[PDB]
RNA sequence: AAAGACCAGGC
DNA sequence: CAAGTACTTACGCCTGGTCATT
């Protein structure tokens, strides 16, 4: 899915296939290094597009003075009941108003959505 | 000229008293406005 | 009415006086129009072309007198001309 | 600048009463009882004394063109 | 210990501190001052020094020195220049500027010598106006009035040539950021622009595109959503693939350019949306090779791979990116920042990233005096020292010797800072149609506010024709920074824009301490840190630069903070913002940034506690100011970005408080939300209850309004002065009107309005005005017109001399009266001089003589006030002569209140004509009703409410915008307890019929303000006057006797009307008639000698077949411009 | 004094 | 025969002041 590097000169390493052994090689072209693939999937193309947003998240947004905090929802992991909701605030969000909660307190940065 | 020369008499005016309601036609104001807000609320709720 | 051998300008028509006006700066100067100045240009370019081809010139002076007459008769006819210079009084200014 | 004598809207000289009105401020009374004290009973003369900028004593700082 | 209900005193207590402290043209002044005492230095010494050469020359500028202004006379002798000398005899109030200078000349013979020439003179900056460098510095208002200087004139604005010039802040992209837009329908999908200075010490500005070439393929390469990011470099003529940019830094392998671009490897979208950028470069794999590939691109390719190597790395370095760093090595650093550019870029791709808002003012700078002063001086520096090279070289192939002070030419610095602050056109003389315009305007001193307002201004530098929306949008970045209000209509609207009152703008501080202190306090910089390691830390930007990465952002911020409020290693003008959402800290130290203070809230309660107010209410003989106030961290300068940051209570009282919470973690609060407002639109009372565009109607009227414009307008000799006779001062005033000294120069008076329909001559927008209130000095104004003449010397036997002609002595005359000229030539005051009299005598020597004395304009009649006399700059006799005419209140006259309600006066009725009440009040202004109901301005109903009920008490009301104790039906209960209606209405009686009006009519004090728009200087007439020299038409204008237009659209409606012979007698017979002789053969005009009648066409030998025609002269000038076009229009008659 | 540019403004 | 480029046009009228060039 991702972009795998060489070990000799580290440049981009592109699929290829080993025509003796029949099977998946990702080979080098700035050298001559061969390496096994275990993936067997050269390209993903995602159009749907139908990423959680709880990965961008970064936890250190609970602590933002602008974003609006309830005490209603507590934190599934700590139990915490102040927490920080913010809608999308990214691509997708002209179909999408789902909020989305950080707990606070230093240390949890727990994450979800409801 | 017939009319401004009645007008004379008759008179016209704008005032404070003419943008000023009735104290139950700003309470039926204040609660339209309020239930309004109170719809967009729970609107705001039901899409999050 | 137009023969295309009338198109190229073989003879420039200086406009009279009053398309181009000399206005008199308190009885003691005579300001010209812009017309004016491009004219004087025209024509000194111009007779130092034709003094160059009676003496013989040198073929590439010939040709910068050319292009410099070529030039200032456009431009006294179009000065909006576009990847040319733009004509300039004795200060900085286009010409009208 | 200086004081209006002649109120514009109805017409009572308000000219003299501006020194006075200064003594009476700068004495005890509030700005309306100073201008009860004055006899401005019609808010017309009342709008001159009390809305009044005596720019007059700006000027006169200056230095005058002839000694 | 705190400030609950006492708060409306608090909160102006500290306001009031602010503005004593600060003042209202602080701006100007500090960009000023930082521009000669930082910027000039920086400038002359930053400037590379001269190198000569066979002997070698040294030329260096070590230290400068700005003295006070002075007036070198036509004898040379030094005398300090006032600045109403200055005014008075159209000097420049200017200081002259003296430079060090070391020249170092090696002759080889292993000794060079080195000779000083100290103090050499080489220009003179004109000085500001009570700036620290001006002669009226530090004086007290005693002193001023000395000078002859009104202690209230705000100063800000450069004399030149005796006039009055304003620099008007000048808008710019904020520099040294990336911007990531998105053009409409480009070739690029989305765009990463940065414009990069390199701390403003050289170069206007290189900026750097970084695109992603939208989603149409080039063939067989692109086969996705939209790829191959490209990089358009400065001095490059066509794009360059980034990857290749960054192996021509010596990046060779992609898993260093991919760190430098990718932050993280473990998010495989960025990768993908990366690879195909790397395919298009795998073809190019050496150092070497990317930068021939940057090279061969150029402005022009090199013969040979060195030069185009050497061009490629210069490029890079120099101008591409060279805010980052100009100094060999710092190609790792300009890595990290195009890195930065791309990822930013594919965060916008992905759609993480808004697309930086157009407009948002946090990406906008404004350039005062000083940014722009220094723009135009660094290129006048440039040229000096160009001249200088150019005289050395001439001089030194000869090799005798040479001097500095002749070579250095003063004209240039003098002249040229001179042109660009009077013309207007920002930049060199030769260059006035490629150079920025609408800069350095005139002050305009009709009214206080109107200077101030000119003072306080910024312009938006987009062209006015725009039809674009969306750049005249109010945004909302401009909360307290720009007045929501004031904007002059018309074309220039929302592009020129007013401060609002609590604004200020950074004047600059460098960087250094900052810098200092993040590296002490932890960071890590850019070069010792792993790629790796740079995913989950903070990015600290200081001016753009990237400084390095920081593991614990909280802490940094919380720290920062604690500094900037306390004011020991960060000035209070810099800003600091933690962008969480994507782990970056910008610092700015940039000049040009646009500040509020705003008061601090720590937890849920102001640091603004009971003992600083205490010490404020005891600001005199305590030493306590705002700046106290500021270094004691209670307030806190917020510029615009780092506004987003901040979450801010409007007022304390209601929002800091516990109830039913909206937001627990304030963290600023405004000092009172009518600072939102700007000068010209804090006057209006009670404006938040107006429709704003009257609003904006308001602001725009009062630069207008009428009043005494400066306390010493007796001694300075201007053009268009209007003084009103008796202002007054509001009796609905705002509180911020103390601070813009409205109620010490008013322009208005208060007027007994009634709101009626009484006679219909106040239809429409009308006023009925009293004619006895008038008659009494209601409204009355001086019109002071100012005429300047100059004798001159201009030929050899040809001069120019004041005297008095003789009936028979000068060759031209006129028919006006020279009766009232004396002896020298100009006449005595006192005088009263009407239309056409003669000013100043005057005549030219002609080559017996011919007069030039000036006239009055048509139809003045006005009485002389005063007339001086002195030298000017070239020492010849200069004359300034005032014309007072006063200018009672007539019915063509223009009024306005102050809410955009405005009107001409329809008739002067007299008092007892005008209704009035039981009492005797007849309404001095009476406005229709019918102008208030559709545009919804209600300041006008209660302002006259609260006239009344201020007039009766005897206090003058409070109209402040957001007061929430001054209700409509407080001020109505206030009025009922004075005998009063409460809605202000009362019981008129017809002044005619003496009956009662059936309808009560509402009658209260309102503010109305006198316009300058008067119509005896609008009424033209015109029949048989001049005509122009080259169209032979009737003149332009009401000055030159001229005549209306027929426009193209006057003449569609006669066609439409179906009226030919009206049409062709304002086409042809009004204007330009004309006789012309067209032969009938050819349509060419032809030779008409009338007097002998021989007309003959040269052409065809014709002299019999001549027809005449009757044309304009407009249309002979067509066709004769034709001809001269080779254009041959034939006229043919059969 | 003249037309050229600019600026501000009025409807 | 498409893909590329350049050119021309973008309300009406009116008021004043300022400046450089003549
Ligand atoms: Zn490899
Ligand atoms: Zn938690
Ligand atoms: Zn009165
Ligand atoms: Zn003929």
Same mark, same amino acid.
């Given at each position: 899915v991702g972009i795998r590097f060489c070990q000799e000169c580290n440049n981009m390493l592109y699929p290829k296939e080993d025509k003796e052994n029949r099977i998946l090689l990702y080979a080098c072209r700035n050298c001559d290094y061969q390496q096994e693939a275990d993936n067997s999937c050269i390209y993903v193309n995602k159009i749907t597009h139908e990423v959680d947003e709880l990965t961008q998240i970064i936890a250190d947004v609970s602590q933002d003075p602008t974003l609006p905090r309830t005490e209603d929802h507590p934190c599934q992991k700590c139990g915490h009941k102040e927490a920080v909701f913010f809608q999308s605030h990214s691509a997708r969000a002209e179909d999408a108003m789902r909020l989305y909660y950080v707990c606070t307190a230093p240390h949890c940065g727990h994450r979800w959505t409801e | 000229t017939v009319i401004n020369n009645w007008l004379l008499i008759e008179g016209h005016t704008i005032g404070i008293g003419d943008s000023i309601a009735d104290s139950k036609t700003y309470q039926d104001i204040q609660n339209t406005i309020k239930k309004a807000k109170q719809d967009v609320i729970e609107v705001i709720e039901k899409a999050h | 009415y137009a023969r295309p051998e009338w198109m190229i300008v073989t003879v420039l028509p200086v406009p009279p006086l009053s398309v181009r006006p000399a206005v008199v700066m308190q009885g003691s100067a005579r300001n010209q129009d812009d017309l004016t100045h491009k004219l004087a240009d025209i024509v000194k370019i111009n007779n130092q072309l034709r003094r160059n081809e009676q003496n013989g010139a040198a073929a590439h002076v010939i040709a910068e007198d050319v292009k410099l007459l070529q030039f200032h008769v456009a431009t006294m006819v179009d000065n909006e001309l576009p990847g040319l210079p733009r004509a300039m009084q004795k200060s900085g200014r286009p010409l009208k | 600048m200086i004081i209006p004598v002649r109120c514009f809207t109805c017409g009572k000289i308000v000219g003299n009463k501006w020194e006075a009105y200064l003594g009476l401020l700068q004495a005890e009374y509030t700005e309306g009882d100073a201008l009860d004290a004055l006899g401005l009973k019609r808010y017309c003369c009342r709008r001159m004394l009390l809305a009044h900028v005596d720019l007059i004593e700006k000027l006169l700082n200056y230095a005058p063109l002839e000694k | 210990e705190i400030t609950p209900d006492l708060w409306q005193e608090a909160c102006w207590i500290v306001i009031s501190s602010y503005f004593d402290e600060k003042g209202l043209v602080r701006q100007q002044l500090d960009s000023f001052d930082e521009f000669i005492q930082m910027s000039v230095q920086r400038i002359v010494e930053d400037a590379p020094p001269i190198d000569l050469q066979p002997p070698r020359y040294l030329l260096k500028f070590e230290q400068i020195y700005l003295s006070k202004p002075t007036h070198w006379e036509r004898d040379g002798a030094p005398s300090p220049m006032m600045p109403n000398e200055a005014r008075l005899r159209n000097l420049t109030y200017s200081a002259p500027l003296y430079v060090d200078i070391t020249k170092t000349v090696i002759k080889e013979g292993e000794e060079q010598l080195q000779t000083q020439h100290q103090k050499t003179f080489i220009g003179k900056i004109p000085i500001m106006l009570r700036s620290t460098y001006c002669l009226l510095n530090g004086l007290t208002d005693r002193d001023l009035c000395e000078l002859n200087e009104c202690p209230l004139d705000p100063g800000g604005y450069f004399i030149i040539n005796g006039s009055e010039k304003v620099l008007i802040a000048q808008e710019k992209m904020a520099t040294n950021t990336v911007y990531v837009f998105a053009k409409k329908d480009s070739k690029y999908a989305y765009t990463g622009e940065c414009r990069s200075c390199l701390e403003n010490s050289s170069r206007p500005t290189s900026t750097i595109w970084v695109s992603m070439l939208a989603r149409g393929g080039q063939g067989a390469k692109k086969s996705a959503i939209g790829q191959r990011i490209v990089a358009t470099l400065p001095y490059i003529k066509q794009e360059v693939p980034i990857i290749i940019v960054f192996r021509a830094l010596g990046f060779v392998s992609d898993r260093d350019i991919l760190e430098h671009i990718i932050y993280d490897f473990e998010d495989p979208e960025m990768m993908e949306m990366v690879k195909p950028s790397l395919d298009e470069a795998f073809v190019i794999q050496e150092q070497n090779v990317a930068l021939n590939f940057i090279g061969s691109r150029g402005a022009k390719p090199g013969v040979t791979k060195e030069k185009r190597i050497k061009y490629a790395k210069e490029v890079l370095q120099k101008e591409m990116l060279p805010h980052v760093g100009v100094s060999d090595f710092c190609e790792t650093k300009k890595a990290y920042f195009l890195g930065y550019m791309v990822h930013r870029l594919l965060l916008a791709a992905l759609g993480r990233r808004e697309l930086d808002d157009r407009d948002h003012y946090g990406n906008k700078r404004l350039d005062l005096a000083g940014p722009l002063l220094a723009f135009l001086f660094r290129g006048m520096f440039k040229n000096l020292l160009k001249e200088v090279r150019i005289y050395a070289q001439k001089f030194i192939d000869r090799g005798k010797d040479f001097n500095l002070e002749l070579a250095i030419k003063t004209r240039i610095i003098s002249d040229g800072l001179k042109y660009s602050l009077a013309t207007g056109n920002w930049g060199d003389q030769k260059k006035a149609h490629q150079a920025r315009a609408g800069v350095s305007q005139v002050l305009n001193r009709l009214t206080f506010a109107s200077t101030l307002s000119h003072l306080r201004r910024l312009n938006?530098?987009? &062209?006015?024709? &725009?039809?674009?929306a969306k750049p005249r949008q109010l945004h909302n970045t401009l909360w307290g920074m720009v007045c929501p209000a004031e904007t002059p209509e018309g074309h220039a609207v929302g592009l020129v824009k007013n401060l609002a009152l609590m604004a200020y703008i950074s004047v600059g501080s460098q960087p250094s301490p900052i810098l200092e202190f993040l590296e002490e306090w932890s960071m890590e910089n850019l070069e010792e840190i792993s790629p790796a390691a740079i995913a989950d830390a903070t990015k600290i930007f200081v001016n753009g630069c990237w400084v390095g990465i920081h593991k614990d952002p909280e802490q940094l911020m919380n720290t920062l903070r604690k500094l900037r409020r306390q004011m020991d290693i960060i000035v209070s003008e810099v800003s600091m913002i933690r962008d969480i959402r994507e782990r970056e800290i910008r610092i700015y130290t940039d000049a040009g940034r646009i500040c509020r203070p705003l008061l601090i809230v720590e937890k849920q309660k102001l640091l603004l506690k009971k003992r600083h107010i205490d010490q404020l209410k005891e600001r005199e003989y305590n030493n306590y100011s705002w700046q106290d106030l500021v270094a004691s961290g209670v307030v806190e300068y917020i510029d615009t970005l780092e506004e987003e940051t901040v979450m801010l209570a409007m007022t304390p009282d209601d929002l800091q408080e516990k109830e039913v919470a909206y937001c627990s973690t304030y963290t600023h609060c405004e000092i009172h939300p009518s600072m939102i407002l700007g000068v010209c639109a804090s006057i209006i009372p009670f404006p938040d209850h107006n429709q704003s565009p009257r609003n904006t109607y308001q602001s725009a009227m009062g630069k207008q309004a009428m009043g005494v414009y400066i306390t010493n307008f007796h001694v300075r000799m201007d053009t268009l002065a209007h003084v009103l006779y008796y202002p007054q001062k509001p009796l609905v005033t705002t509180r911020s009107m103390e601070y813009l000294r409205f109620r010490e120069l008013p322009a208005g008076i208060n007027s007994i309005v009634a709101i009626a329909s009484y006679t219909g001559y106040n239809q429409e927008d009308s006023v009925i005005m009293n004619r006895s209130a008038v008659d009494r000095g209601f409204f009355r104004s001086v019109f002071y017109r100012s005429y300047k003449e100059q004798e001159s010397k201009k030929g050899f036997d040809q001069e120019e001399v004041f005297e008095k002609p003789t009936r028979e002595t000068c060759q031209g005359m006129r028919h006006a009266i020279y009766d009232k000229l004396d002896d020298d030539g100009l006449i005595a005051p006192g005088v009263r001089v009407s239309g056409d009299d003669v000013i100043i005598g005057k005549t030219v020597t002609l080559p017996t003589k011919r007069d030039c004395s000036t006239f009055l304009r048509t139809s003045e009649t006005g009485i002389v006030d005063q007339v001086m006399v002195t030298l000017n700059q070239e020492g010849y006799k200069f004359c300034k002569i005032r014309v007072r005419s006063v200018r009672i209140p007539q019915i063509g006259d223009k009024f306005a209140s102050r809410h955009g309600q405005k009107g001409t006066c329809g008739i002067q009725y007299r008092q007892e004509d005008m209704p009035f009440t039981c009492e005797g009040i007849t309404p001095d202004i009476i406005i229709n009703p019918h102008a208030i109901p559709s545009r919804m301005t209600i300041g006008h109903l209660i302002e006259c409410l609260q006239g009344k009920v201020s007039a009766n008490k005897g206090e003058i009301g409070d109209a402040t915008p957001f007061n929430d104790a001054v209700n409509v039906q407080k001020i109505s209960n206030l009025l009922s307890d004075y005998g009063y209606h409460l809605r202000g209405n009362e019981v008129l009686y017809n002044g005619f019929t003496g009956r009662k009006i059936t309808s009560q009519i509402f009658i209260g004090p309102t503010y109305y303000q006198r316009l300058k728009h008067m119509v005896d200087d609008k009424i033209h007439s015109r029949a048989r006057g001049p005509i122009q020299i080259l169209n032979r038409q009737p003149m332009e204008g009401r000055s030159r006797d001229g005549g209306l237009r027929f426009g193209e659209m006057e003449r569609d409606c006669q066609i439409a009307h179906g009226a030919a012979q009206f049409l062709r007698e304002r086409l042809f017979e009004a204007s330009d008639p004309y006789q012309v002789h067209v032969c009938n053969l050819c349509g060419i005009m032809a030779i008409a000698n009338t007097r002998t009648h021989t007309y003959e066409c040269r052409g065809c030998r014709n002299k019999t077949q001549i027809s005449l025609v009757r044309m304009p002269y407009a249309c002979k000038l067509l066709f004769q411009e034709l001809m001269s076009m080779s254009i041959a229009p034939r006229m043919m008659s059969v």
């Amino acid at each position: 899915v991702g972009i795998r590097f060489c070990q000799e000169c580290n440049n981009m390493l592109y699929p290829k296939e080993d025509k003796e052994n029949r099977i998946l090689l990702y080979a080098c072209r700035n050298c001559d290094y061969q390496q096994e693939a275990d993936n067997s999937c050269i390209y993903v193309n995602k159009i749907t597009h139908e990423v959680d947003e709880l990965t961008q998240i970064i936890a250190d947004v609970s602590q933002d003075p602008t974003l609006p905090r309830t005490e209603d929802h507590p934190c599934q992991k700590c139990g915490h009941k102040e927490a920080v909701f913010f809608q999308s605030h990214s691509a997708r969000a002209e179909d999408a108003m789902r909020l989305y909660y950080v707990c606070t307190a230093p240390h949890c940065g727990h994450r979800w959505t409801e | 000229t017939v009319i401004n020369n009645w007008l004379l008499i008759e008179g016209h005016t704008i005032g404070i008293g003419d943008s000023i309601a009735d104290s139950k036609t700003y309470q039926d104001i204040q609660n339209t406005i309020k239930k309004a807000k109170q719809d967009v609320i729970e609107v705001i709720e039901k899409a999050h | 009415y137009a023969r295309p051998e009338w198109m190229i300008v073989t003879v420039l028509p200086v406009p009279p006086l009053s398309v181009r006006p000399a206005v008199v700066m308190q009885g003691s100067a005579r300001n010209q129009d812009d017309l004016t100045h491009k004219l004087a240009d025209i024509v000194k370019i111009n007779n130092q072309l034709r003094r160059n081809e009676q003496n013989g010139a040198a073929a590439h002076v010939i040709a910068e007198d050319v292009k410099l007459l070529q030039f200032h008769v456009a431009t006294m006819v179009d000065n909006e001309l576009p990847g040319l210079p733009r004509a300039m009084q004795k200060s900085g200014r286009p010409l009208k | 600048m200086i004081i209006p004598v002649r109120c514009f809207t109805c017409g009572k000289i308000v000219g003299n009463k501006w020194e006075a009105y200064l003594g009476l401020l700068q004495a005890e009374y509030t700005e309306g009882d100073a201008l009860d004290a004055l006899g401005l009973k019609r808010y017309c003369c009342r709008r001159m004394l009390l809305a009044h900028v005596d720019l007059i004593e700006k000027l006169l700082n200056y230095a005058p063109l002839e000694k | 210990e705190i400030t609950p209900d006492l708060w409306q005193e608090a909160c102006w207590i500290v306001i009031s501190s602010y503005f004593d402290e600060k003042g209202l043209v602080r701006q100007q002044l500090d960009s000023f001052d930082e521009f000669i005492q930082m910027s000039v230095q920086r400038i002359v010494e930053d400037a590379p020094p001269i190198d000569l050469q066979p002997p070698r020359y040294l030329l260096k500028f070590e230290q400068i020195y700005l003295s006070k202004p002075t007036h070198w006379e036509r004898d040379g002798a030094p005398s300090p220049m006032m600045p109403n000398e200055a005014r008075l005899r159209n000097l420049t109030y200017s200081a002259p500027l003296y430079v060090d200078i070391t020249k170092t000349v090696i002759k080889e013979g292993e000794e060079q010598l080195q000779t000083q020439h100290q103090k050499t003179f080489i220009g003179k900056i004109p000085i500001m106006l009570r700036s620290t460098y001006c002669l009226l510095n530090g004086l007290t208002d005693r002193d001023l009035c000395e000078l002859n200087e009104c202690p209230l004139d705000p100063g800000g604005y450069f004399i030149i040539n005796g006039s009055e010039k304003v620099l008007i802040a000048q808008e710019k992209m904020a520099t040294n950021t990336v911007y990531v837009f998105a053009k409409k329908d480009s070739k690029y999908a989305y765009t990463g622009e940065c414009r990069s200075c390199l701390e403003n010490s050289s170069r206007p500005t290189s900026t750097i595109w970084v695109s992603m070439l939208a989603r149409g393929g080039q063939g067989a390469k692109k086969s996705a959503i939209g790829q191959r990011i490209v990089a358009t470099l400065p001095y490059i003529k066509q794009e360059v693939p980034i990857i290749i940019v960054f192996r021509a830094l010596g990046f060779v392998s992609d898993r260093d350019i991919l760190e430098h671009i990718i932050y993280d490897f473990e998010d495989p979208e960025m990768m993908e949306m990366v690879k195909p950028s790397l395919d298009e470069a795998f073809v190019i794999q050496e150092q070497n090779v990317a930068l021939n590939f940057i090279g061969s691109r150029g402005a022009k390719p090199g013969v040979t791979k060195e030069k185009r190597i050497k061009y490629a790395k210069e490029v890079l370095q120099k101008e591409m990116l060279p805010h980052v760093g100009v100094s060999d090595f710092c190609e790792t650093k300009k890595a990290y920042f195009l890195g930065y550019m791309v990822h930013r870029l594919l965060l916008a791709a992905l759609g993480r990233r808004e697309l930086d808002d157009r407009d948002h003012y946090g990406n906008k700078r404004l350039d005062l005096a000083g940014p722009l002063l220094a723009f135009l001086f660094r290129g006048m520096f440039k040229n000096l020292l160009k001249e200088v090279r150019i005289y050395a070289q001439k001089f030194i192939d000869r090799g005798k010797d040479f001097n500095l002070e002749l070579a250095i030419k003063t004209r240039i610095i003098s002249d040229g800072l001179k042109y660009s602050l009077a013309t207007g056109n920002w930049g060199d003389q030769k260059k006035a149609h490629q150079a920025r315009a609408g800069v350095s305007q005139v002050l305009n001193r009709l009214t206080f506010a109107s200077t101030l307002s000119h003072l306080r201004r910024l312009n938006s530098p987009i &062209g006015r024709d &725009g039809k674009l929306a969306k750049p005249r949008q109010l945004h909302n970045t401009l909360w307290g920074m720009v007045c929501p209000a004031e904007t002059p209509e018309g074309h220039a609207v929302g592009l020129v824009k007013n401060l609002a009152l609590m604004a200020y703008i950074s004047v600059g501080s460098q960087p250094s301490p900052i810098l200092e202190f993040l590296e002490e306090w932890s960071m890590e910089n850019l070069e010792e840190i792993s790629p790796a390691a740079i995913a989950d830390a903070t990015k600290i930007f200081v001016n753009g630069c990237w400084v390095g990465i920081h593991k614990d952002p909280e802490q940094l911020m919380n720290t920062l903070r604690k500094l900037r409020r306390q004011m020991d290693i960060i000035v209070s003008e810099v800003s600091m913002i933690r962008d969480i959402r994507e782990r970056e800290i910008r610092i700015y130290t940039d000049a040009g940034r646009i500040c509020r203070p705003l008061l601090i809230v720590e937890k849920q309660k102001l640091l603004l506690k009971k003992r600083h107010i205490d010490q404020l209410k005891e600001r005199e003989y305590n030493n306590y100011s705002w700046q106290d106030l500021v270094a004691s961290g209670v307030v806190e300068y917020i510029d615009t970005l780092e506004e987003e940051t901040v979450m801010l209570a409007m007022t304390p009282d209601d929002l800091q408080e516990k109830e039913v919470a909206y937001c627990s973690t304030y963290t600023h609060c405004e000092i009172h939300p009518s600072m939102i407002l700007g000068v010209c639109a804090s006057i209006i009372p009670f404006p938040d209850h107006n429709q704003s565009p009257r609003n904006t109607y308001q602001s725009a009227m009062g630069k207008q309004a009428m009043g005494v414009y400066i306390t010493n307008f007796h001694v300075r000799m201007d053009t268009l002065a209007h003084v009103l006779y008796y202002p007054q001062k509001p009796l609905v005033t705002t509180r911020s009107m103390e601070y813009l000294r409205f109620r010490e120069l008013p322009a208005g008076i208060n007027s007994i309005v009634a709101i009626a329909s009484y006679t219909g001559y106040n239809q429409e927008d009308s006023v009925i005005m009293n004619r006895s209130a008038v008659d009494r000095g209601f409204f009355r104004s001086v019109f002071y017109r100012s005429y300047k003449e100059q004798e001159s010397k201009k030929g050899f036997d040809q001069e120019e001399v004041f005297e008095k002609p003789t009936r028979e002595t000068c060759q031209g005359m006129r028919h006006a009266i020279y009766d009232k000229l004396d002896d020298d030539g100009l006449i005595a005051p006192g005088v009263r001089v009407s239309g056409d009299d003669v000013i100043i005598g005057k005549t030219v020597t002609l080559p017996t003589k011919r007069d030039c004395s000036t006239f009055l304009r048509t139809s003045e009649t006005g009485i002389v006030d005063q007339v001086m006399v002195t030298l000017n700059q070239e020492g010849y006799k200069f004359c300034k002569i005032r014309v007072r005419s006063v200018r009672i209140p007539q019915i063509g006259d223009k009024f306005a209140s102050r809410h955009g309600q405005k009107g001409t006066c329809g008739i002067q009725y007299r008092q007892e004509d005008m209704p009035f009440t039981c009492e005797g009040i007849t309404p001095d202004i009476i406005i229709n009703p019918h102008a208030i109901p559709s545009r919804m301005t209600i300041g006008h109903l209660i302002e006259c409410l609260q006239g009344k009920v201020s007039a009766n008490k005897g206090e003058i009301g409070d109209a402040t915008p957001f007061n929430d104790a001054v209700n409509v039906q407080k001020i109505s209960n206030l009025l009922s307890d004075y005998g009063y209606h409460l809605r202000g209405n009362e019981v008129l009686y017809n002044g005619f019929t003496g009956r009662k009006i059936t309808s009560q009519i509402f009658i209260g004090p309102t503010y109305y303000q006198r316009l300058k728009h008067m119509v005896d200087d609008k009424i033209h007439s015109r029949a048989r006057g001049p005509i122009q020299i080259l169209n032979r038409q009737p003149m332009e204008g009401r000055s030159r006797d001229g005549g209306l237009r027929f426009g193209e659209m006057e003449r569609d409606c006669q066609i439409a009307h179906g009226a030919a012979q009206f049409l062709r007698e304002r086409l042809f017979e009004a204007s330009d008639p004309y006789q012309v002789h067209v032969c009938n053969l050819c349509g060419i005009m032809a030779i008409a000698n009338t007097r002998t009648h021989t007309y003959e066409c040269r052409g065809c030998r014709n002299k019999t077949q001549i027809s005449l025609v009757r044309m304009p002269y407009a249309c002979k000038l067509l066709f004769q411009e034709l001809m001269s076009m080779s254009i041959a229009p034939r006229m043919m008659s059969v």
